């Protein structure tokens, strides 16, 4: 009813400006006064925090937020919970990225140049490769979970926690999830940064999930100008319905992105349009 986010958490983190929000959390820039470090603190949203479902969900996700050490992955530093007069306010402390999500880039700027999109997604592949080698499937690859920093570094975040626009067909069906599910979802992001649109939209998540399972994506070159057939092949391989027909690893996907960036033919099956 009237929870508000305090100016200090746990007498160590002094909150500065609000950076963003999502369906659960509000993310603030903060100063870690103990380590003299600027950090991002993800706090359960004040307007949701007294709602038992949301509180409990936040706690279940905080204890599963994967802590990986890689230049393209947002580090997770700590978790905690502030006592306030309105009740407990749980939070996660993570690496601060001064930058913009791919969601916000596509919204405000439209599609990226193809070379830039290739570069960003190839860097995201490195993050995912590292995660997979450490036994962690991301599970929630989407444009909001990839940022480009002010120094043009790619940062992927929010790994390992178990919208419908970016789910893999196997997630839509409740089947087993593995590295190829992250490939598919990253293929959805690639599709969107190239064309300005996700592959599938609909009036409900049931309708969007149905499309992931049953309907072929419109080839990117048909959705938007300046896109090559070689890029169609790479994107549509990532988006193959059967996991066995996708890139089997994030590294394999990267290798094809690197070919296309260099004007070399990709290994992905050719796609013909008219
Ligand atoms: N480490 C970070 N550094 C800077 N900004 C961040 C960071 N993490 C998240 N943000 C921003 O905070 C927003 C909310 O992040 P999240 O709570 O993870 O929700 P989301 O990923 O946008 O969407 P949902 O809720 O998962 S659908 C992001 O969209 C960014 O705008
Ligand atoms: Mn996120």
How far apart, in whole angstroms, are the C-alpha atoms of residue 93 and residue 37? 11
Cβ-contact 124, 189 below 8 angstroms = yes
How far apart, in whole angstroms, are the C-alpha atoms of residue 159 and residue 61? 10
Residue numbers after which the chain breaks, C to N beyond 2.5 angstroms: 162
Question: CA Rg, the chain, in Å?
Answer: 19
1-96 CATH pick, 3.40.50.2000, 3.30.200.20, 3.50.50.60, 1.10.10.410: 3.30.200.20
Q: Which residue has the tokens 């009813």?
A: 1
Q: Are strands 13-21 and 154-156 parallel, antiparallel or unpaired?
A: unpaired
The fold for domain 98-269 equals Transferase(Phosphotransferase); domain 1 (1.10.510)
Nearest C-alpha to atom 24 of ligand 1 is from which residue?
22
How far apart, in whole angstroms, are the C-alpha atoms of residue 42 and residue 264? 42
Q: Which residue has the tokens 């080839």?
A: 219
| Structural resolution in Å | 1.6
Mutate to test the pocket of ligand 1, among 25, 45, 77, 97 (most ligand atoms within 8 A of CB): 25
Within the chain, how many helices (H) and strands (E) appear?
Answer: 9, 9
Tell me how the structure was determined. Answer: X-ray
How far apart, in whole angstroms, are the C-alpha atoms of residue 240 and residue 245? 6
How far is the centre of ligand 1, averaged over its atoms, from the C-alpha of 188 (Å)? 18
Is the distance from the beta carbon of residue 25 to the nearest atom of ligand 1 less than 6 Å?
yes
Domain limits, CATH 3.30.200.20, in the chain: 1-96
Look at residues 78, 121, 73 and name the one whose alpha carbon lies nearest to residue 97.
Answer: 73
Domain limits, CATH 1.10.510.10, in the chain: 98-269
Nearest C-alpha to atom 19 of ligand 1 is from which residue?
22
């Amino acid at each position: 009813s009237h929870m508000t986010t305090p100016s200090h958490l746990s007498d160590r983190y002094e909150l500065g400006e609000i950076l963003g929000f999502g369906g659960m959390s509000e993310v603030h820039l903060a100063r870690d006064l103990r380590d003299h470090r600027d950090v991002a603190v993800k706090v359960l949203r004040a307007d949701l925090a007294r709602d038992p479902s949301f509180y409990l969900r936040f706690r279940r996700e905080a204890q599963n937020a994967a802590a990986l050490n890689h230049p393209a992955i947002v580090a997770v530093y700590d978790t905690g919970e502030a006592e306030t007069p309105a009740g407990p306010l749980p939070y996660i402390v993570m690496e601060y990225v001064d930058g913009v999500t791919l969601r916000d880039i596509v919204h405000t700027e439209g599609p990226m140049t193809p070379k830039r999109a290739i570069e960003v997604i190839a860097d995201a592949c490195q993050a995912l490769n590292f995660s997979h080698q450490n036994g962690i499937i991301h599970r929630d690859v989407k444009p909001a979970n990839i940022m480009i920093s002010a120094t043009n570094a790619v940062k992927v975040m929010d790994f390992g926690i178990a919208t419908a626009q970016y789910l893999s067909p196997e997630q839509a069906r409740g089947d087993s999830v593995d590295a190829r599910s992250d490939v598919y979802s990253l293929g959805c992001v690639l599709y969107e940064v190239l064309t300005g649109e996700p592959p599938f939209t609909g009036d409900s998540p049931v309708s969007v999930a149905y499309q992931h399972v049953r309907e072929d994506p419109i080839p990117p070159s048909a959705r938007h100008e300046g896109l090559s057939a070689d890029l169609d092949a790479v994107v549509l391989k990532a988006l193959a319905k059967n996991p066995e027909n996708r890139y089997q690893t994030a590294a394999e996907m990267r290798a094809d992105l690197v070919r296309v960036h260099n004007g070399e033919p990709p290994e992905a099956p050719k796609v013909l349009t008219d």
